[PDB]
Structure 1
Amino acid sequence: MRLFGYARVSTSQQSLDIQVRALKDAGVKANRIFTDKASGSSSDRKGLDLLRMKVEEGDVILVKKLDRLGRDTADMIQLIKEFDAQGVSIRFIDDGISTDGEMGKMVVTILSAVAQAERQRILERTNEGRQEAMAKGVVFGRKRKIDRDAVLNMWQQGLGASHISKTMNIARSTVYKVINESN
């Protein structure tokens, strides 16, 4: 049937070639193969997108390794679930992991699980660690740098908010805010 191949790389066009050539080894059609660069689950999906819409059911997507499907293991899982529901099977060449055949159903269910767990593992640790950091008094956020004392002084000296901004090179909002926030 229609066989497709997905590749992706951060910057290394070289690492991409290696994938693409390894993909062709099984799936010859380069028009079907869809590559990507500038990795990002926050915005990068373009190439994969052309793949999505072209891929009908009973199709096979060939990837080189798990680390080539999505930026975050989460993303990868999301796609796997996606294509699967549409009836498309993803087969990771090197890893020998496939989402079709008898294994299929279980492979995906295992995939989602091992991933399910790690997401918690890291979250738990972040929460746990942010708590202690907080208890210790660790201050989060942008370290104040505005010379709040200066803004206040000038203001006391009959100066105008506008001047305090124009000469200090800060926004009127922070100037008024500094004054207003203070006790």
Structure 2
Amino acid sequence: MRIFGYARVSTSQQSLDIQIRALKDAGVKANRIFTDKASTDREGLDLLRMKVEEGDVILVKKLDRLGRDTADMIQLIKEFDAQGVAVRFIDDGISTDGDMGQMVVTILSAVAQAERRRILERTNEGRQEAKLKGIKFGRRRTVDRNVVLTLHQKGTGATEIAHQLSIARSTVYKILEDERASA
């Protein structure tokens, strides 16, 4: 019944020390904590993979701090559950053990195979070149592209369209470049 913990960041040392301090207050010994930072340097996680034994429990601050994605996360959770090793996520109040633990691993296994079949879908038609994150980032497009394309198609010069729609001349070329690359 050994207690372990894991913490992962990209760069920041402070937010890493935040997790470590949380694990230490959770009753995890200092030597029982493994960490990583960004090549794929997982050595802290790999060392945890080695040391863990049946009956051992691994404490993690949040779900996002485990895998590099949803797939990797469940892949890891399954890996520890196979060995009887339980994972408890502190802030989210979730565990792979106790009572609901099996239900936890069950639904986690469902979405895993579900998205794996979704990967099998995308792979056939093709997606990955696109790489959809799902969150909308950046300034919204306020410019009507259709008007720009139509005018230029009629032979209207670059500076004439820019003066027409009150955009920059460079903006016109960016629009023409984006739609040309699209075609």
Counterpart in 1 of 2:13?
13
Radius of gyration: which is bigger? Answer: 1
Counterpart in 2 of 1:81?
78
Consecutive unaligned residues of structure 2, counting only runs of 5 or more, are 131-183
Q: Are positions 1:106 and 2:113 aligned together?
A: no
| TM-score (normalised: structure 1) | 0.62
Deviation digits for residues 40-70 of structure 1, max 9, x if unmatched? 7xx3321011112221111110001111111
- 1:12–1:119: structure 2 CA closer, same or farther, 3 Å change rule? farther
Match of 1:78, as an amino acid?
A: Q
- 1:126–1:9: structure 2 CA closer, same or farther, 3 Å change rule? same
How far apart are the structure 2 equivalents of 1:16 and 1:123? 36
CA contact (8 A) 1:3 1:62 kept: yes
Deviation digits for residues 80-109 of structure 1, max 9, x if unmatched? 111111111001111111100121111111
Comparing 95-104 with 107-116, greater Cα deviation is found at 107-116
How far apart are the structure 2 equivalents of 1:91 and 1:36? 19
Counterpart in 1 of 2:164?
none
| TM-score (normalised: structure 2) | 0.62
Tell me the matched-pair count.
128
Instruction: Give me the CA root mean square deviation.
Output: 2.2
CA contact (8 A) 1:4 1:27 kept: no
Comparing 119-128 with 89-98, greater Cα deviation is found at 119-128
How far apart are the structure 2 equivalents of 1:36 and 1:116? 27
SS in structure 1 at match of 2:58: strand
How far apart are the structure 2 equivalents of 1:123 and 1:85? 25
Consecutive unaligned residues of structure 1, counting only runs of 5 or more, are 134-183
How far apart are the structure 2 equivalents of 1:48 and 1:128? 35
Q: How far did 1:72 drift?
A: 1.7
Q: How far did 1:121 drift?
A: 4.5
Q: How far did 1:119 drift?
A: 4.6
CA contact (8 A) 1:11 1:37 kept: yes
Match of 1:117, as an amino acid?
A: A
SS in structure 2 at match of 1:24: helix
Counterpart in 2 of 1:3?
3
Identical aligned residues as a percent: 92
Map 1:151-170 → 2, pairs under 5 A:
none
Q: Are positions 1:34 and 2:34 aligned together?
A: yes
Counterpart in 2 of 1:178?
none
SS in structure 2 at match of 1:108: helix
Counterpart in 1 of 2:50?
53
